[PDB]
């Protein structure tokens, strides 16, 4: 989550209906747009932000939220316009001996701004004396491990979260929803619409 991945999507048709009916989603919250209306909208760019958190931390991924994940690992704007999808990955990201590869930022001087990524591993200075790259009293490593296990509770179980953000600028749009098309009618007075030409 502290090094959450971001991918830019553009110049393609986004099929929202099939994307939303693929897997069983434990969490699906869209803000500023209904899930169905995206099939009708065009946007300049799309951003796919993927990471893994705890179940109890999933609530942190929403506009106007606070917490360790919200403040130090991944921050959303209060006016976020986009969707959030989250699903348990206990059968994927949990190990018998503990899956410690997933990490999260614990100590940070200031909270993250929206869509700001912090990958610093510098020893956090929790006291007046400097740490100088040395961890100890009042000097702690800023990142902490999750250690997911299959026998943990769903709150402690890993959850994969993807945030879809829709950037709409004053530039020619690149991503739109699926175009419908009805059957053809001949030799009859009809209200036709060919490729947007009505």
């Amino acid at each position, epitope marked *: 989550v502290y090094a959450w991945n971001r991918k830019r999507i553009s110049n393609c048709v986004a099929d929202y209906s099939v994307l939303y009916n693929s897997a069983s989603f434990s969490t699906f919250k869209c803000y500023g747009v209904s899930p169905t209306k995206l099939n009708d909208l065009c946007f300049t760019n799309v951003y796919a932000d993927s990471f893994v958190i705890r179940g109890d931390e999933v609530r942190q991924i929403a506009p106007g939220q606070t917490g360790n994940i919200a403040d130090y690992n991944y921050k959303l704007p209060d006016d976020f316009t986009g969707c959030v999808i989250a699903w348990n990955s206990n059968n994927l990201d949990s190990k018998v001996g503990g899956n410690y590869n997933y990490l999260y930022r614990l100590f940070r001087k200031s909270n993250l701004k929206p869509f700001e990524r912090d990958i610093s591993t510098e020893i956090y200075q929790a*006291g007046s004396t400097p740490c100088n790259g040395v961890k100890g009293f009042n000097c702690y490593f800023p990142l902490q491990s999750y250690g997911f296990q299959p026998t943990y509770g769903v709150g402690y179980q890993p959850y994969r979260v993807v945030v879809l953000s829709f950037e709409l600028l004053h530039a020619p749009a690149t991503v739109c929803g699926p175009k419908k098309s009805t059957n053809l009618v001949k030799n009859k007075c009809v209200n036709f619409n060919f490729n947007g030409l009505t």
Partner: antibody
Amino acid sequence: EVQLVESGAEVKKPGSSVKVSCKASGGTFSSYAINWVRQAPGQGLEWMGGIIPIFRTPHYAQKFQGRVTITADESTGTAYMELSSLRSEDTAVYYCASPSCGGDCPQYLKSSKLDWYFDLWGRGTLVTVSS
Amino acid sequence: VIWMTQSPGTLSLSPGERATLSCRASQSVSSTYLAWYQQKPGQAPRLLIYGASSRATGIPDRFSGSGSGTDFTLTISRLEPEDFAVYYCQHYGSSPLTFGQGTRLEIK
């Protein structure tokens, strides 16, 4: 109001274990510096260890290493101290104590945290170890 | 480990007299990391002084702390009957946190 409340008194046999609790109330429990201090009858004060729950990294005094386990439950606002392989010399009053921030008060950068009181020592739980 | 040694072990004085208690660290410590406590029989310790000389809230003006490096003192300028107790110094600047063995203040 900020207060510490220990569990009731315990009577144990040598070689067994004791687990005492300290409930903290007031403020944010996750950043609460909980320390354990014991006092044997007629003896001085001995610091055993402590924890700040958010870091999940307990500290122990070398005398108690491998016998003491300190944990915290953030959902109940409760710290626990477990002492194993008990001896008659472990007969003592066990206090919880958190002077403002334990060992992380002096922080004048990230935030304010310039609070320092003098009323954060639990009254104590008597553990008696006898055959 | 830093050890703290108090002196005297017992001090016998009358109300109205001045008490002075000493605490010696086994090595030089920052004065920021030295405290003094009072303990009455059957009561938890009460903080009197922190940072070698800063008085805790609601502690009377008769209590003062001083010293630096290895050598620290607690002074009670005029003893009151409620001051007869055990006093402990503490070093809190690194693990393990250490207390002195105590000084018992008794009525003469």
